[PDB]
Every structure is written in structure tokens, then in C-alpha cells.
Symmetry: D2
């Protein structure tokens, strides 16, 4: 069944950008809760789809999306962060330049749309295999990113930043680039491009 | 596996309120398509859930909701229509009077919200078990009627009326009350109160 | 133009249920921001609607809803909270009993749907003048409550509780009833019922 | 005040691809209704904004979006259709080849997503100024095409095809390319790149 993945670092290792208390709650309470609930829902969905209990299958969809999306998004998020993440691979940098002009333009554009999310959500850098281009997008709540492979996500649910940054979401979104795990992001890019 | 239910009457039995060409297309083409697509989508969902492919399972939700709702809604709709519908049961009529004042008030209010649907959708009379009251609502596309048991539905997708009524949706919505199957609606009401 | 209303109490007066820091940020940063942005948007919307700049009018809608809704909701919220709120009027209690059985059932049912909000949102007790009944509902983000008069709202955006309650939204939703301003809620009920 | 634009051709000029009865209803009934409703809704919105009645202004958003989008979309659609459409301009064809590989690939991809619309909506070819690329998208109902300038639209509301094509939407979507007004589409492209 689905399990809570261990973080690739210790709870305080992203300080001073994201605090120990945030990492601890975000992992041990929020992500844990999505996993526990997803397992209950997924079992129920398997039951209903097998038995052709259609009204119940349809009813279980929003909870599967929310908790499943929560599990997907946070699992990617933890791999996307590092105390010293390094720099983008030459192939990823070259592609960032091609599709956004520069890393600066990408960071600005993604930070801006992510900051602008109304309510809870996530910003994403992804790769679209069909049209062979990097794209940026936002998603409401825990809706998984669709139509492109995720590379780097920024959680802008208030629980992601509030204990440290309070209302100042922009400072958190700008600061998270300091701990972007470019090694991992580059690996995801390579994989999406095979 | 889901199957297309036979109509409880022949294709021309609802004339002049709904034409035989409409009933033929609506059942043999539209509903049949929802069933065929539903079966394929359920198969793909069962596979995704069995494999633990969470992103794939979530991605199938819109299609299951759309085709599953299509199957559910049209299945109900055929049972809700009759040339000889009869009258509400005393218990249903009494409840209509209690909750809407009169059958006249119910018909007007449900017709008005149904006529007002922007795009494709349905109008519903339903029964809420929790609060033991009749309610009316509309749903977009084939979205689920949430929190109430469906009693009587009015399809205002353009395919439900256009060949006969053209753009004049109101003439259709007002006329459908003439073929409401109150025997069926009363049975659904009795079941909902069990 | 729209202005930030003063709170009817001092920032620490709802302790220990809602902290001074939360009240201060919630009022001086979050609500202030909705007001400042609403004024900019409303001016732009007036411009576009007067000049028949239709694409721009449509584009400005989501920001008007979000900031306008923010202003509406928070203005009601501050009047809904008090250190000693009193008890519901006899007329409101009688109506709560009629429509929910008891205050306990109302509190449980409203707390449950409010707790269950996926992402950011609000829970509401309202009064529907058409069917002359109390109702409960939730709204996503800052979508104003529609179809009924608002009486009591519970903000479950994470900024409403996180500094104090962290992830434990249920404890905040249960505890807020301790500071429900029943004098104000009763007054809104009386007004909705004229 | 908004007005119903005359068609740039007579009602039967698009036969056998779109019937004269469809063109007549679509323009004289459907589009006319969007215009008439738009004018009324704009008036009510102007009044609400002038009065500072924020809840009322917000409540009018769905109707403005729906009728305003109806007016915008159909206005574009009439200019996008011609018996003698011609061929894309060299600059547009070159861009189609750059961004989709071929006109064949564009037509297939846009047709497929358009055919796949669940419920009422539209398919679009558009141009994104920011990234200087052509894109395709669908929109539900009359929702705005966001972030790109519309070039060519395909209405797949059932009223756009049902009298002629009945349930066979694909035959309509494949056939409409025969009457795409490439002169108009090329002009819109040139304007979008200014
Ligand atoms: Mn999170
Ligand atoms: Mn139908
Ligand atoms: Mn708030
Ligand atoms: Mn149309």
C-alpha cells in the first residue's frame, strides 16, 4: 500500500529558507494524512469499481484526487528541495534558455503565476513530450499536474510557509529557488526526454 | 458490465411532446455511447487502481463522471417518462404541498431553474433523507446530484429537444410535465423514505 | 471607496481561542490587502463596463470575486466573533431546533462540512428567505455565499488558524463556537426575516 | 450597446457543410439572444458597480461571462467561415509548420480535442504573444480563451450541428475545415503579431 516516503534530508536542513517546524508538520502531519486517507479511499474505490457500484465510485473521486494528488505532489516536492541543490545540467539550462530566454525569466514567470494562485495550490515547471517544450502552470488544491511531466513544484498552500513567512507568500516563492534541487530536477528532465 | 436498458415504451409513444426521432437518437446513439464508453473507462480505471497507478486513475475521473453520469441520468430519465404517467401518490403530493406549497409552485420553480441552465445539463427534483425534505437543483453536463436521491429529471442538453423544439427550450421544459411518470416518481419517493 | 472596518474588539480579546498574532495579521494584512486590491479592480471594472470593453470586463471578474468576496466575508466574520457573545435569541434558537433538531446538531453538522473543505474556504450558517429555513453550506476560496442570507461564517483558510492550531483544523472549528457572537448572529437573523 | 453583427454571407452560403436552417437559427436566435441578454446584464452590472453593491456585482459574473462570451465567440465564428476561404498566408502556414509540423497535424489535433469536448463548448486555434507560438485549446460553454489571441474557433455546442449531423459530431468537425476562412484567420494572425 502507499507509504510516507522518508525525506532525503533532516528536518532543519533547509533553514533558513524553510523552518524545521514547517518541514516536520508538512511531512509528519500533512503528507502522512494524505497517505492514510488515500489508502482508505483507494481500497474503497477498488471495491466499488470491481462490483460496478457506480454512484459510489463517482462519489469517491474527489477524495481520491485530493489525497492521491497530495501524495503525488508532496513526494515530488521533497525530492525537489536540497540544502545544496547544485545547478541545472547543461542540457536543462540550454532548454530553459530556448523556451524562456533565461533562468531569470523562468524564475520570474513561474514565481509570478505561483504567487497569484487564489486560495490553495501549486506552481509547476514541467516538460511536454508531445510539443517537446518546457511549460509552466499552476494547479488548484492538490489537482495533479496534467499534460506534462512534472520537474519542479512549488507548494503555495498556506501550510507550506505561514509559520515562517506569515502572509508574505512572495518572499517564500522567491526564496525557494535558493533550495531548488537542480540535480533532481535535471534527472526528471532527462527521464521525461527519453 | 453495464448495458443499455430497453425503453419501457416504443420510440413514438411520447409524441407529440417528444418526437420519435429524438427518442431513437437519444437512446440508441447517445445513451448507448455513454454505456460503451463507461465500460471502457471502468476497465481502464480498474487496471490503474490494480497497478497502483495513481496519476492514471485520477486522470480517468472526468471520463468516468461524464459517461457514468450519462448512464445513470438517462437510465432514470426513461423510467421518469410515460404517456400514461398518472398522478402523484397521496404521500408525494402531500410532501410537494408541504415543501413547495403546491404542485404548480414546484413545476414553475423547477422549470425556471432548468430553463436557466447555461450550456448542457439537467434539472432535478430530489429527496434529501437527512432533512426529510424535497429539493430542486440543476446539474451541469452529467454531474452527480449530490446529497439528495433523484426522483424526477429533465434533460436540457440540446440533443434532448433541438430536432423538435429548435432553440425554444422553454416550450420543451413546460411540455415535459405532461409525460412525467408520476407512478415511477412516487415509487422513487417511497423508496427514498425507507 | 471600500475601507477596512475597525474590529469591534482589541486584537487579543478572543484569546485563547484565536491569538493576537492571528487577529492582527488577519485584519491588518489579509483583509487590508483584499480592500486595497478590490478598490483597484472595482475602478477598472467600472471603466471597462462603461466603455463596453467586454473582454477586459470578463477578465476582471475572478479578481473582483476573490477580493470582493474577501472583503464581504471578513467584514461579516469580525462582527460574528466576541469575547462574550451571549446566547441565541429565543426566536433564533426556536428556528435552529425546528430546522436542525438542536443547537448541538447544527454545530456538529456545520463543523463537519467546514472541516471537510478541500483547500481554502468558508463554512456558513445562512437563512433562505424563499423557503424560510436555515441552511448550512461551504464556499471555496472567497466565493460569496449565494442563495441565502449569511448569519455566521467560519473561515477555514489556513491563515485563519495555522499559527495557533497548526494542522489541527478540527480543533479550531470546534473551538470557534466558544466565541460565536450570538447577539450579532441573532440580529442578522432578525434582519433576514423581515 | 452591443449589436448583432450581420453575417458576411447569406444563410445558405455554407451548404452542404452547414445547413441554411442551422445558420438562420444560430445567428437570428442564439446569437441574438446572447446580445439581448448581454445588454441587460451589462446594465445591471453597471448599476451594481455604481451603487457599490458588491454582492450583486459578483452575482452577475456568471451571466456576463456566458452571454458576453457567447457574443464574442459567435462574432468571431461568423468571420472565420467562408465558402471561398482561400489558403493560409505564407507567414501563417510557415508558423503552423513550425509549431505543429504540418497543417494536417494541426487539423487532426484540433479536431480531436474539439470532438472530445464533454458537453457544450468550443475548440480554438490561438496565438500566444508572450511565447510567440500557436496553440490549441478547448473551452467549456462560452468560457474565455485565456492567455492567447483567438484565430479560428469551432463551435461544438449541439445547436451548431445537430439538425444536420445529429449525434455525429465528428463528421461536422472534420467537415468545417472545408469552410475555414483562411483570409480572416491569416488577418487575425497578422494582427496578433503586431
Ligand atoms: Mn503541502
Ligand atoms: Mn441526454
Ligand atoms: Mn481569512
Ligand atoms: Mn453556438
Amino acid at each position: 500500500k502507499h507509504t510516507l516516503p522518508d525525506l532525503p534530508f533532516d528536518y532543519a536542513d533547509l533553514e533558513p529558507v524553510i523552518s524545521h517546524e514547517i518541514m516536520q508538520l508538512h511531512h509528519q502531519k500533512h503528507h502522512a494524512t494524505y497517505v492514510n486517507n488515500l489508502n482508505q479511499i483507494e481500497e474503497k474505490l477498488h471495491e466499488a469499481v470491481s462490483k460496478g457500484n457506480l454512484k459510489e465510485a463517482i462519489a469517491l473521486q474527489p477524495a481520491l484526487k485530493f489525497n492521491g494528488g497530495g501524495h503525488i505532489n508532496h513526494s515530488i516536492f521533497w525530492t525537489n528541495l536540497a540544502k545544496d541543490g547544485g545547478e541545472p545540467s547543461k542540457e536543462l539550462m540550454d532548454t530553459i534558455k530556448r523556451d524562456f530566454g533565461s533562468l531569470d525569466n523562468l524564475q520570474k514567470r513561474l514565481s509570478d503565476i505561483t504567487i497569484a494562485v487564489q486560495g490553495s495550490g501549486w506552481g509547476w515547471l514541467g516538460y511536454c513530450k508531445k510539443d517537446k517544450i518546457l511549460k509552466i502552470a499552476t494547479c488548484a488544491n492538490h489537482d495533479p499536474l496534467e499534460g506534462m511531466v512534472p520537474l519542479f513544484g512549488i507548494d503555495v498552500w498556506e501550510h507550506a510557509y505561514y509559520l515562517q513567512y506569515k502572509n508574505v507568500r512572495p518572499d517564500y516563492v522567491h526564496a525557494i529557488w535558493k533550495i531548488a534541487n537542480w540535480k533532481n530536477i535535471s534527472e526528471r528532465f532527462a527521464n521525461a526526454r527519453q
